[PDB]
Design a protein around this ligand. Structure first.
Ligand SMILES: *[C@@H]1O[C@H](CO)[C@@H](O[C@@H]2O[C@H](CO)[C@@H](O)[C@H](O)[C@H]2NC(C)=O)[C@H](O)[C@H]1NC(C)=O
Ligand code: UDP
Ligand code: NGA
Ligand code: NAG
Ligand code: NAG
Ligand code: MN
Length: 536
C-alpha cells in the first residue's frame, strides 16, 4: 500500500516563524568590530564569534520551490543512520548541526545520529561533548584511534550504521524544513539511487542563509578535477521545477544512500587520504555500475563553506594522490586529459590500486566513455577535454594613444589601465602585464593562451571601466566581440571599449568604427575563429 502523508510539521513552522533574535530566519548577524577580528576565523575557517552569538536552534528561511510545500511522501519510509564526521570542529557550529537534525527530522525516521570524531585534539570535543550528547539518546559518539581523514572517518560511521539508508552530513550544516522525507522517499522507490539535497550557503562571516548562485544546477568538473556546477540543459529541465533531477557528480558531503547499496559498491576507496576525490569516486561508481544520482530540490541543507582550511594535514599527503587513484580506476582514457594539464601525475605513485580495480570489474560497470557521453554529456561544453584554439593573443595596443593595454597585476579588481608598450623588452621592475588572450569562450583574459588566468574582462554599464572580475563561463558581461573595424564590442551593454586620450583608464562608451581610441590591435590572430561568432 502506497498510503501517502504530509510530513510537514506545520506547528514547528509556525513556532520557527515566530522565533526572534540575532540570525533568526537566516538573516545576517549584526556584525560589529568585535566579531570582525581575525581570531574569530583561526580555529574553523569561519566566524566562531558570530556562531557563538547565534542560537543553536535558530530558524531558517524556507527558500524551497513553492511546489515543495504541497508535495507528500510515503507514510512508511525506511529509517536512516545520520553520520557526521568531524575533526577539531567548533563547539557551537557542531551543536547547531545536531540540533537542526534533532528538531527538523522526524524521530521515527531517524534510527541514530552518529558523530564520528576523527582524532580531534580540541578539548571541548572530549568530556564536554560527551556529557552534552549523553542527554540526547539518539546521539552517539564514535572515535577513531588516530587521524583517519574524512573519507575513512565516514567509512567508520558507515560500518556501524544500523539504519536502512546512510545519510552523510558535514559537521557545520543546518537542515532546513522537512528535508529528510523527500530523500528517503526517493531511495524507497529506487534503492540504487543516491540522493543529494540542495546545498545552501551559510556565510562564513555573518552566517546568513542563502542558496548558492544559480540554485538547482548539475554537478561537473574541470579537467584539473575542481568541482564545478553547470546549468541544467533545457532538454533535461523537468516540467515541475521542484522535481528530482539528475546530477553527474555530487558535491560530496551531503547525500543519502541505501546502506546495502553503499557497501555493494564498496563504499569509498580506503586509500583516499584526508580530503578530496571521494565525491568523484562514488559519483562515477553509482552511474557506471547500475545506480543513479539525483538532487532533490525539496530537500535543503545549509552548509558553511570555509574561508580557509584550519586543520593540519600529515606530511606526504596531497589531493593529487587521491585524484590519481580515482582517475586510474574509473576514468579510463580520460585520465590522460588530466595529465596533459598536470604532468607530475604521470610518474606519481598512486599506491596499490589492484584491490580497487578488482572491485570495478566485479561490478560489471560501463566505460567512463559511457558516463561522459550519456551522463555528463554537457560537461565538455564548458570544460572541453581539449580546448579549442584562441582567436587572438599577445599585446593589445590602441591605435589612438599608441599605448598598450596593461594591468598592475591587479588580480582582485583593478581597471584595465593604459601603459607604454613593453613588447617583452621591458623591465619587470615596473610590473607590466601586457599579454592577453581572447580565448575560445569569446572572453578576454590575461596571460598566454596556454597560461591564461581565471580573470576575465568584465564591464557593467556602457561607460564604466573594464575589470578583471572572476571568469564565469557565461557570455554575460564577459562576452566580447573583435570585429574587422578593430573594436572590442560588448553586446550585453551595446557599447564598445574606449580610452581617455589624456592617458587615462580604459572605459566603455558609444561605439564608433571611425574613432582611434576605440581601435585595438592584437599581436596575433586566427580569422578562422574571428569569423565564428561575429555573424548571425
Ligand atoms: C533546541 O533544540 C533542543 C534539541 O532538540 C531542544 O531540546 C529537546 O527538546 C525536545 C522537545 O521536542 C525534548 O523532548 C528534549 O527532551 C529536549 N532535550 C533535552 C534533553 O533537553 C531544546 O529545548 C530547543 N530549545 C528551544 C529554543 O526550543
Ligand atoms: O581529516 C579530516 C578532515 C575533515 N573532516 C570532517 O569532514 C567533513 C568534511 O570536511 P571539510 O568540511 O573540511 O570539507 P569542505 O566542506 O570544506 O570541502 C567535516 O565535517 C570535517 O570536520 C574529518 O573528519 N577529518
Ligand atoms: C558541501 C560539500 O559537499 N563539501 C564537500 C566535503 O564534505 C568533501 O566531500 C570534499 C571532498 O573531500 O568535497 C566538498 O565539496
Ligand atoms: C587557428 O590556428 C590554429 C593554429 O595554431 C589552427 O589549429 C586552428 O584550426 C585555427 N582556428 C580554427 C579553429 O580554425
Ligand atoms: C528502522 O526500522 C527497520 C525496520 O523497517 C529496522 O531494521 C531498523 O533497525 C530501524 N532503525 C532503528 C531505530 O534501529
Ligand atoms: Mn564542509
Amino acid at each position: 500500500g502506497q498510503k501517502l502523508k504530509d510530513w510537514h510539521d506545520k506547528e514547528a513552522i509556525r513556532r520557527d516563524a515566530q522565533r526572534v533574535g540575532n540570525g533568526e530566519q537566516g538573516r545576517p548577524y549584526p556584525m560589529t568590530d568585535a566579531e570582525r577580528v581575525d581570531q574569530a576565523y583561526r580555529e574553523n575557517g569561519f566566524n566562531i564569534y558570530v556562531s557563538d552569538k547565534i542560537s543553536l536552534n535558530r530558524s531558517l528561511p524556507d527558500i524551497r520551490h513553492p511546489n515543495c510545500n504541497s508535495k507528500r511522501y510515503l507514510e512508511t519510509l525506511p529509517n536512516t543512520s545520520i553520520i557526521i564526521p568531524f575533526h577539531n570542529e567548533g563547539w557551537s557550529s557542531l551543536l547547531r548541526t545536531v540540533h537542526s537534525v534533532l528538531n527538523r527530522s522526524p524521530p521515527e525516521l531517524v534510527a541514530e545520529i552518529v558523530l564520528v570524531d576523527d582524532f580531534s585534539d580540541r578539548e571541548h570535543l572530549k568530556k564536554p561533548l560527551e556529557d552534552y550528547m549523553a542527554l540526547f539518546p539518539s546521539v552517539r559518539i564514535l572515535r577513531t584511534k588516530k587521524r583517519e581523514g574524512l573519507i575513512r572517518t565516514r567509512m567508520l560511521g558507515a560500518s556501524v550504521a544500523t539504519g536502512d539508508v546512510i545519510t552523510f552530513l558535514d559537521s557545520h550544516c543546518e537542515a532546513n524544513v522537512n528535508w529528510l522525507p523527500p530523500l528517503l522517499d526517493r531511495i524507497a522507490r529506487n534503492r540504487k539511487t543516491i540522493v543529494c539535497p540542495m546545498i545552501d550557503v551559510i556565510d562564513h562571516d555573518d552566517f546568513r542563509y542563502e542558496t548558492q548562485a544559480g540554485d538547482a544546477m548539475r554537478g561537473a568538473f574541470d579537467w584539473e578535477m575542481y568541482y564545478k556546477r553547470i546549468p541544467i540543459p533545457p532538454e533535461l529541465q523537468k516540467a515541475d521545477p521542484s522535481d528530482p533531477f539528475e546530477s553527474p557528480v555530487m558535491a560530496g558531503g551531503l547525500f543519502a544512500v541505501d546502506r546495502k547499496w553503499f557497501w555493494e559498491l564498496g563504499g569509498y576507496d580506503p586509500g583516499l587520504e584526508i580530503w578530496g576525490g571521494e565525491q568523484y569516486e562514488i559519483s562515477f561508481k553509482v552511474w557506471m555500475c547500475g545506480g543513479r544520482m539525483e538532487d532533490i530540490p525539496c530537500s535543503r541543507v545549509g552548509h558553511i563553506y570555509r574561508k580557509y582550511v584550519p586543520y593540519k594535514v600529515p606530511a606526504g599527503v596531497s589531493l593529487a594522490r587521491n585524484l590519481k587513484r580515482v582517475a586510474e580506476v574509473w576514468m579510463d582514457e580520460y585520465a590522460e586529459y588530466i595529465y596533459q594539464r598536470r604532468p607530475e601525475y604521470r610518474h606519481l605513485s598512486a599506491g596499490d590500486v589492484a584491490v580497487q580495480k578488482k572491485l570495478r570489474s566485479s561490478l560489471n560497470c560501463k566505460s567512463f566513455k559511457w558516463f561522459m557521453t550519456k551522463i555528463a554529456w554537457d560537461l565538455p561544453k564548458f570544460y572541453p577535454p581539449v580546448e579549442p584554439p584562441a582567436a587572438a593573443w599577445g599585446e593589445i595596443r590602441n591605435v589612438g594613444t599608441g599605448l598598450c593595454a596593461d594591468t598592475k597585476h591587479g588580480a582582485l579588481g583593478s581597471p584595465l589601465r593604459l601603459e607604454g608598450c613593453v613588447r617583452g623588452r621591458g623591465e619587470a621592475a615596473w610590473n607590466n602585464m601586457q599579454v592577453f588572450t581572447f580565448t575560445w569562450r569569446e572572453d578576454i583574459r590575461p596571460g598566454d593562451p596556454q597560461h591564461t588566468k581565471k580573470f576575465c574582462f568584465d564591464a557593467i554599464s556602457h561607460t564604466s571601466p573594464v575589470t578583471l572580475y572572476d571568469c564565469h563561463s557565461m557570455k554575460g558581461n564577459q562576452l566580447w566581440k573583435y570585429r574587422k573595424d578593430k573594436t572590442l564590442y560588448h553586446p550585453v551593454s551595446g557599447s564598445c571599449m574606449d580610452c581617455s586620450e589624456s592617458d587615462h583608464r580604459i572605459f566603455m562608451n558609444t561605439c564608433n568604427p571611425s574613432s582611434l581610441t576605440q581601435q585595438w590591435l592584437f599581436e596575433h590572430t586566427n580569422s578562422t575563429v574571428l569569423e565564428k561568432f561575429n555573424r548571425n
